[PDB]
Design a protein around this ligand. Sequence first.
Ligand code: RU9
Ligand code: RU9
Lengths: 282, 282
Amino acid sequence: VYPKALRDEYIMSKTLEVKLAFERKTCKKVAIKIISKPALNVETEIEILKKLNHPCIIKIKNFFDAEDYYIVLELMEGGELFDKVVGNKRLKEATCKLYFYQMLLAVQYLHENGIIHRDLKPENVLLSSQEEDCLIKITDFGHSKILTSLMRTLCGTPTYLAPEVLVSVGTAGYNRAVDCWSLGVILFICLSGYPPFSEHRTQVSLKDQITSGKYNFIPEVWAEVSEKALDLVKKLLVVDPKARFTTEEALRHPWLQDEDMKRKFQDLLSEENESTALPQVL
Amino acid sequence: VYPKALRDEYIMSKTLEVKLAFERKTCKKVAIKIISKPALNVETEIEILKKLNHPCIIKIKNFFDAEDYYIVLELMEGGELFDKVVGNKRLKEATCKLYFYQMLLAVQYLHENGIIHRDLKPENVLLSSQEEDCLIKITDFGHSKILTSLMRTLCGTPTYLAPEVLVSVGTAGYNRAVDCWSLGVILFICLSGYPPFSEHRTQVSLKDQITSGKYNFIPEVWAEVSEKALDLVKKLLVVDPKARFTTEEALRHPWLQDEDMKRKFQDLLSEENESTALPQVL
Ligand SMILES: NC(=O)c1ccc2nc(-c3ccc(Oc4cccc(O)c4)cc3)[nH]c2c1
Ligand SMILES: NC(=O)c1ccc2nc(-c3ccc(Oc4cccc(O)c4)cc3)[nH]c2c1
C-alpha cells in the first residue's frame, strides 16, 4: 500500500519505478519515482534536486520517506529520449542540435555547481512534450557525485606520503569529463540511430572498443549527417580526459553556432515560463 | 572552559591538542584529545575506535560533543615514537624490530577490517612505557578511509561509460598500499635516524625523490644495520603499489622471523593483560 501521507496529497495512477499521479489540490499531473529500501543515494538526489534551479534540469515537488522512498517530480509529457532512438530510429539533425544544446546547458550548469551526473543516457533525458520541437530536462541524480583530501594532503609536507598520491595530482579534477564522454555517446546515437560501441558484428570486446576509442563508423549512415556534427562527436569521444572537450568548448563548437535553433529554444522556454510568471515592475 | 559533563567525570590537567586527565571514579590517568569545530573526520574516528579491538591499537574510553570535540583515550606513558627518533637519535635494531612487528600487526588488522589509516608517522605511534622494551599502539584515525561504486558500475553494461573508469579498474583495490609506504619510511627512520626523503643537501625536489623512489642512502650510517633489515625497507619503498610488500608479506620477511622478539612481545602483552583479566574456567 501507498503511505497515508502520500495518498493525502496525491492520487496515484499508472506506472510509466515511476508512476503517474495527480495533485489533489491542483489536479495537476506529477511523476513519482519509487525506490525500495541505500539512503545515501536517495539522500544525495534529494539534496541535489532541492538546490538546483535550471530549465533543463527536472524539479522536485515533494518527497516521502516511508515503507519505501517516494520522490515527486515534474511530469514530462514527452517521456524518455530513449523511446525516440530505440530500434534504430534516428532524429533529424536539427532536432539533435536542439536537444543537445539543452543537454550541454544542463551539464554545464551541473559542472559549474560542482556536481557530476555520472549516469547520462537517453533514458535519463526527458522531453517536455510529444512534439519533436520541445524542451528537454535531465533527471536521475542517484549516482551523482558532489565535489577534497588531496588538497589537504598537498598543504602538508609529503615526508611519509606514498608516490601514487603525488602522481595522482596530475590527473585530479577531471572527473566531470566522464559526463562529456556520455554526452558524446548520446549525440552519436541521436545522429546515427546506432551505438558507437557495441558487441554487434565485431570481434573486439566492448571494453577494448571503448578504451581504444575506436567507435564503429558506418559511412552509409553518416553520409546523411553534416561534417560539423560529426566533428563535435569526434571531439567528445576523445580517450584522454585532459584533451576531451568540456561543455564550454562544446557550446562554442561551430555546430552549435545556429541562431535559428537558439531562437526556437528561447521560444519554448518562454512558453513554459508563461502562466508561471508574475507581472513585472517596469 | 571545559564542558560541565566532562568536568563531572574527569579532572583536566597538563597539555601533552592532547592533555592529561584523571578519571574521578578510578583516579586513573587518561589522554584527552581536543578538536575545535569537521564533524565527519571526528565522526569517522569515533566510528572507527568504537569497533576496533587490538592490543596495538589505542582504545577510546569516552567522547564529548560540545563547544569543542573531546575524545578520551588510554594514556600511553611512553609518549610518541617521534620523540625517540627526532634529532638524529636512532633506536637499536632489535628495538626497531619489536616496534615494527607491532606496527605491522596493527596495520594488518586495520587492513583486514577494511580500514586505511592514511597518516602513519612516528607521532601517531604511541609507546606504552618509558622502557625501550614496551608495547606500541597506533592512534589518530581522523584521516582514515573505510572500504564501492566501481563494483556497481562493472555490473552494468558500459555502453555510456567513459574509458578512464574502465582503465581505473586495473589499479583499484590497492589503496591500503599507501599505509605500507608510510611504514617503510618509518622503519627507514627508526633504523638510521634520518629520513629517506628530504630537502637536506640535495638538488632534487622532495616530490621527485619520492616519485622516483630514490631515497638518500648513506653507507656509513647503514653499515651498522643488518642486510635483512635494509632488505625489508627496500621492499616496502617500492614505487609500484601492486609490487609493494603488503603487511602479510612483511610479516613473513626473514627479518621478522625472530623468535626472541616475538617472545618478548608475548610477555609485554601478558603483563598488560594481567590485572585486566578475569579468572578462567578450566
Ligand atoms: N529515473 C528518473 O529520475 C525519472 C524521473 C522522471 C521520469 N518521467 C518519466 C516518464 C514521463 C512521461 C512518460 O510518458 C508519459 C506517460 C503518461 C503521460 C504522459 O504525459 C507521458 C513516460 C516516462 N521517466 C522518468 C525518470
Ligand atoms: N593524535 C592522537 O590521536 C593521539 C592520542 C593519544 C596521545 N597521547 C599522547 C602522549 C602520551 C604521553 C606523553 O608523555 C607523557 C606525559 C604525561 C604522562 C605520561 O605518562 C607521558 C606525551 C603524549 N599523544 C597522543 C596523540
